[PDB]
Amino acid sequence: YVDMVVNAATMMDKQNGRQKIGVMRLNNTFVGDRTYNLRDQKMVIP
Amino acid sequence: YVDMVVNAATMMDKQNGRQKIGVMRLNNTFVGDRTYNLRDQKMVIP
Amino acid sequence: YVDMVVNAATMMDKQNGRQKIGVMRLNNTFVGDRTYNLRDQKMVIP
Amino acid sequence: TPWSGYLDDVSAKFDTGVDNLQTQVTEALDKLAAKPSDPALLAAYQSKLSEYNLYRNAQSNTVKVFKDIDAAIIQNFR
Amino acid sequence: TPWSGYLDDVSAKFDTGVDNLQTQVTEALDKLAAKPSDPALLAAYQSKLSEYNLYRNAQSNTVKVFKDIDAAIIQNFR
Amino acid sequence: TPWSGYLDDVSAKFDTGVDNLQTQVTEALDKLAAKPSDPALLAAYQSKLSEYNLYRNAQSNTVKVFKDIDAAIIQNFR
Amino acid sequence: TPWSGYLDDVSAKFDTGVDNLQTQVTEALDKLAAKPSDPALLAAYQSKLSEYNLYRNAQSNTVKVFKDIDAAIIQNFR
Amino acid sequence: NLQTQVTEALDKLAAKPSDPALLAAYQSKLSEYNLYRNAQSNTVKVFKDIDAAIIQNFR
Amino acid sequence: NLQTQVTEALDKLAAKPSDPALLAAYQSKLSEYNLYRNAQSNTVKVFKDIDAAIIQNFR
Amino acid sequence: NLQTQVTEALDKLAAKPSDPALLAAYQSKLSEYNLYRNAQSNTVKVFKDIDAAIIQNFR
Amino acid sequence: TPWSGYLDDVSAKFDTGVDNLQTQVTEALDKLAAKPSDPALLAAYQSKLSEYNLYRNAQSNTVKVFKDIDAAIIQNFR
Amino acid sequence: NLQTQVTEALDKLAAKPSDPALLAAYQSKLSEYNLYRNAQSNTVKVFKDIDAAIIQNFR
Amino acid sequence: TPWSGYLDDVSAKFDTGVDNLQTQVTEALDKLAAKPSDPALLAAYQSKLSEYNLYRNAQSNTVKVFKDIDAAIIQNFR
Amino acid sequence: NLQTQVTEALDKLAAKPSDPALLAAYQSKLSEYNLYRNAQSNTVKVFKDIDAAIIQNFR
Amino acid sequence: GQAVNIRDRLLQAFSGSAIATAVDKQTITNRIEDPNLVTDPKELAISQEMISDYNLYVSMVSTLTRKGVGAVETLLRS
Amino acid sequence: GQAVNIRSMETDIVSLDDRLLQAFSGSAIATAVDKQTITNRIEDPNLVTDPKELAISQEMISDYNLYVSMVSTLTRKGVGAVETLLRS
Amino acid sequence: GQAVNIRSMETDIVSLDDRLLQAFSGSAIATAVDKQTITNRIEDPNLVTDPKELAISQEMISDYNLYVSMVSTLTRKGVGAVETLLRS
Amino acid sequence: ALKQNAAAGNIKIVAYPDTNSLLVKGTAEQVHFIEMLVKALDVAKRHVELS
């Protein structure tokens, strides 16, 4: 009885994928980087 | 009694993380580095 | 009694810092290095 | 504390030998861009820019030599 | 317990002998890649790349010497 | 997984460090080739060509440095 | 059966750590030799050929350190 | 259990045989496992050889 | 039958002794074939050496 | 006590791995320590072997 | 007494064989870094650096020759 | 007395390590002292091994 | 009698192959250094300095080849 | 008699170390004497070893 | 999936040591006929133990039989 | 930390065999610990790396190897002298 | 500054037993000093780093090997001549 | 003793102008320690008027 319980306990420890695409539509802002050419300094908005 | 207690204590010490994003809206200061073109020296406030 | 005390002392000696940020507001001087365009010499005070 | 080696310290000696010449070239440039037709300002900027060209060129070739001194000896370890 | 040998401690002395050069190489690349036209950034970057080159070379040649000492002794066991 | 070495990721940081320089050199050329006699367009194209020349030369020479560092280590395997 | 060894383990361990370098250098030789002047393609393959040189010496010099130790065992057979 | 942490560090060098920090630690690892294995081979060998010498004497 | 699948890789390098992938796989074969041949010769040798010692003892 | 003055020059190279004069003195030290260690190993080696030759002779 | 071997004494002989090479590199650099546009200082600094370049290379090469001779002798002890 | 004219040419190069005629002459000396010493090392070696073989033969 | 080897005799063939070339470089430098703007003195000095460069390079490389020949036989003694 | 025409081309190059045709024949000469000398040393060595191996078996 | 199973004194001793020496012969025969087991180093070490204990075992019962029968002749000749 | 044992124990002997048996027991206690402590020096793999503790572990082999070889051949000759005399 | 002694004294033997004691005692001092000579050659670390002194220490090792090996086999063949005569 | 085994070089100080402040970092006493330095580093300066 001892040799079965020990050997069948260490064999559940040794025992113990698809990607997917999501499309999300924004509602209050554009996408992509914008530039503001205020001609004093190149300000960037990522 | 002794061979059980020593063996079952040195097998508990031999048995012994998710990042996350936070969004913080400021209230008293802009974000990002600003530049002050005071035309004597290019001063920057980080 | 002697073999117990020696073997317990040499098993205790084998078993034997957090950073933190402080914000200090100054009161009598600006911060950062300055440059003095006094047109005799671009003088700097670190 | 940001660590600084000996090769860092040789290039810093050129940096401390001039006090704020990197500032002085930009400041002489800032007065020039407002009115780029004054010969007294052009001759001042020609002197400081030519001083700044030899500053960086003399700095970068000397550090390259000390790299080659160390690399020839370290190669002779094994 | 993760084991660490004697050869780890000699190589660890290079790791602890310099403070944050692994950070400093990473820090020098981000300031250069943001604006790869600043002469103040160019002279600093020549020094740090050459410092990291001598860093790894000094590490690897030292371990090779101590490696050859032990193998001559282990052969001299029997 | 598209494999990327360490040298691939450093060179990608140069590509992302400039916003649209691969587009802008070809695009500034297209505005220049329609009318290659506008001084406002000539001074703009002089800036982008010299920036793209210094961009690729500093990028390609940097990978060459990291190449010689690894080969000194790989030779010290055996 | 097509049999694998422990030395075949470590060599194919290199072939699964890398993913497409045995063919990623083939798409850039089709690409760069098509127009042999593009700067985004010249530096593309130089990031591909260089990593091809470190990976093939790493899969090679691992073999020599892993052979002679098994020679040292069989030398200790008699 | 030294061979365990040998067999866990080669794969990141397999996935990245261009990281300068990793192969430096890998060489300090892999040469150290090389010195251990032949040491074990040489140390059992003398313990066999001197054990073979006693039966060589009494035969 | 190990020598068979050794002797099947020499011919493709014979037609092309410049392929980088083939000689990488071939070195993994030939050094492994080096480990097989002398191990078998030395291991039969102990089985040879110890039976003669018995008759040297009993004579 | 030679290993002491071995262990005092590597750390200064650890703190400064770009001084040309210091690593020159360090190279002259550690290679000289390379000559000492195999000297002690090779010289004890003959004294085991010649002492084993006597018992090989007298057996 | 801190021990110094014969190979130390050979390398120490180079240190006493040159009079002030450690001083001459530092003093010529400090006068040059104060004003890096003097042709009298440029020709003086080129001279002082090249003497230090051949000095250390001759030092490091000298210890390697006497080492492999000794290593050939130590193998021939037993 | 070969070591004498070994130890006499380093000093003029020590006082002047930029003369082109001397280091060429210095190299012609030092490689020959390199060639002489191991020759002496190799020649004592044959005289030990063949002398050890005689007592190995008669034992 | 001061002893001279075979490597001395090969270098002596260079020594006898040039008559007074160690003198001729110094004398040509002395006429040029008195007036370094004379085309007759410049053209004489370019020839004599460059001949001494090929003289020593051919001299120094020849002793190195005969050294490796000698080391293979002495290694093949025992 | 190869060493004669070895010893006959260096001296004419010594008097004129800038003739392009002469050092080309000299390089074809001087590298060839390097290939001859080590060939004789390596070939006597096996002939010493194979002559020593038979008496090594019967000793 | 890996598996495991669990399960006159001279007349049992010679029969007991009959197959006791036979199975260690066969288990090292297919240890070496399996080429996967001869490439790993730590499998060579446990087979190196397995060769060495084979020699000491059957030699101990050899000589002790020899000394066992060596004690019988002298008493019978008396 | 370190720890040494200052007290050595001793027993009276009355006969000749126990004087032989304490050399027999004294040799068995030396080899049983010295076969193991150098392996503990081998199995601890930091002890197989430093050249300082490598050179003492180099010579500890020779201390173990020459000692057991001496007591073998002395006993081989010692039992050999009793063999020949009773055969005569 | 080094030193040599020039007197090799002679005491009379009264027997062969008195003769053998000089040859052993004259050799036991000599075999102790040379092994102690080569260690102090080694233990002085400035002696083992010079090229000229290495061939001196190379010579003194190989003479020590050839000396004690030559006295071992003669005594082995000497006592071997005894065993055959007593067996006859 | 191990918290008194902090490196002096592990001190990192940055300026921050838009609140006229310093940001320092370290273990629990050296942030208090260099506070004593900066509290004795800005005194109110005095005016001098020329004629």
DSSP for chain K? -----HHHHHHHHHHHHSSSHHHHHHHHHHHHHHSTT-HHHHHHHHHHHHHHHHHHHHHHHHHHHHHHHHHHHHHT--
**Structure tokens given for E42:** 């160019």
* CA–CA distance, J16 with D4 (Å, rounded to integer): 8
Which chain B residues are Cβ-neighbours of D33 within 8 angstroms? Answer: none
Other C-beta atoms closer than 10 Å to the C-beta of P12 total: 5
| Residue type at position D42 | L
| 3-class secondary structure per residue, chain O | CCCCCCCCCHHHHHHHHHHHCHHHHHHHHHHHHCCCCCCCHHHHHHHHHHHHHHHHHHHHHHHHHHHHHHCHHHHHHC
Would you call H54 and P35 a contact, using CB atoms and an 8 Å cutoff? no
- Of E25, G63, E42, nearest to H20 by C-alpha is E25
User: Which candidate in P54, P59, P64 is best for mutational testing of the J interface (most J CBs within 10 A)?
Assistant: P59
- Of M77, A10, R30, G7, nearest to O38 by C-alpha is G7
Is N17 within 8 Å of N23 (Cβ atoms)? yes
Is the Cα torsion angle K4, K6, K8, K10 positive or negative in sign?
positive
* CA–CA distance, J3 with I50 (Å, rounded to integer): 48
Would you call O45 and H40 a contact, using CB atoms and an 8 Å cutoff? yes
Would you call E20 and D3 a contact, using CB atoms and an 8 Å cutoff? yes
- Of M27, I37, P40, nearest to G77 by C-alpha is I37
- B39 sits in the region (left: phi over 0; alpha: psi -120 to 50; else beta) called left
* CA–CA distance, L57 with M8 (Å, rounded to integer): 45
| Residue type at position G45 | Y
- Of N46, E78, Q55, nearest to K72 by C-alpha is Q55
* CA–CA distance, I5 with G2 (Å, rounded to integer): 9
In order, the DSSP letters of B3-20 are HHHHHTTTTTTTT-----
* CA–CA distance, B30 with B34 (Å, rounded to integer): 9
**Structure tokens given for E6:** 């004697």
* CA–CA distance, C20 with A29 (Å, rounded to integer): 39
- Residue E12 DSSP code: H
Which contacts qualify for G65-71: CB closer than 8 Å, 24 or more apart?
Answer: G65/F77, G65/F78, G65/H30, G65/H31, G65/H34, G66/G7, G66/G10, G67/G7, G67/I31, G67/I34, G67/I35, G69/H34, G69/H37, G69/H38, G69/O41, G70/I35, G70/O38, G70/O39, G70/O41, G70/O44, G71/I34, G71/I35
User: What is the length of chain L?
Assistant: 59
Is P55 within 8 Å of J41 (Cβ atoms)? yes
* CA–CA distance, J16 with D35 (Å, rounded to integer): 49
- Our CA-based measurement puts residue R46 at a distance from the nearest CA of chain D, in whole angstroms, of 28
- Our CA-based measurement puts residue G28 at a distance from the nearest CA of chain I, in whole angstroms, of 18
Question: How many helices, marked H, and strands, marked E, lie in chain D?
Answer: 3, 0
Chain H residue with CA closest to F78: the answer is: H31
* CA–CA distance, N41 with C26 (Å, rounded to integer): 84
Q: If DSSP codes are grouped into helix, strand and coil, which group holds residue R13? A: strand
Kindly report the CA angle at P77 between P72 and P79, in degrees rounded to 5? 95
Answer whether M70 touches L (CB < 8 Å). Answer: yes
- Of P50, P56, P52, P26, nearest to P38 by C-alpha is P56
| Residue type at position O32 | I
Measured CA to CA in angstroms, residue N49 lies from L38, N43, N45, N53 at distances of 22, 10, 6, 6
Give the β-pairing of R21-26 and A43-45: unpaired
Is R32 within 8 Å of R6 (Cβ atoms)? no
Which chains does O contact via 3+ CB–CB distances below 8 A? Answer: A, G, H, I
Instruction: Tell me how far the alpha carbon of residue D27 is from its chain's centroid.
Output: 16
Would you call A7 and O2 a contact, using CB atoms and an 8 Å cutoff? no
Per the listing, tokens 């694998």 go with G4
CA diameter of chain K: 63
- Our CA-based measurement puts residue H54 at a distance from the nearest CA of chain P, in whole angstroms, of 7
State the DSSP H helix or E strand holding residue C23, giving kind and residue range, or none if neither.
strand C20-25
Angle of the M21-34 helix axis to the M39-75 helix axis, nearest 10: 150
Residues contacting I57, CB < 8 A, separation 6+:
H59, O62, O63, O66
**Structure tokens given for Q68:** 């004690």
Q: Residue I19 — φ and ψ, nearest 5°?
A: -75, 125
Burial class (CB in 10 A: 0-12, 13-18, 19+), N33: middle
Angle of the J20-58 helix axis to the Q52-87 helix axis, nearest 10: 10
Is F62 within 8 Å of E47 (Cβ atoms)? no
| Residue type at position Q82 | V
Which chain I residues are Cβ-neighbours of O59 within 8 angstroms? Answer: 50, 53
**Structure tokens given for O77:** 């000749």
Q: Residue B28 — φ and ψ, nearest 5°?
A: -130, 0
Interface of N with L in 30-59 (CB under 8 A): 59
| 3-class secondary structure per residue, M31-70 | HHHHCCCCHHHHHHHHHHHHHHHHHHHHHHHHHHHHHHHH
* CA–CA distance, R47 with R51 (Å, rounded to integer): 13
Answer whether E18 touches D (CB < 8 Å). Answer: yes
Residues contacting Q41, CB < 8 A, separation 6+:
Q47, Q48, Q53, Q57, Q60
Angle of the F39-75 helix axis to the G39-75 helix axis, nearest 10: 0
Would you call C6 and P1 a contact, using CB atoms and an 8 Å cutoff? no
* CA–CA distance, P13 with P25 (Å, rounded to integer): 14
- Our CA-based measurement puts residue G45 at a distance from the nearest CA of chain H, in whole angstroms, of 16
Which chain K residues are Cβ-neighbours of D58 within 8 angstroms? Answer: 32, 36
* CA–CA distance, M22 with O3 (Å, rounded to integer): 86
Instruction: Tell me how far the alpha carbon of residue P21 is from its chain's centroid.
Output: 14
Answer whether J46 touches Q (CB < 8 Å). Answer: yes
* CA–CA distance, D54 with Q20 (Å, rounded to integer): 90
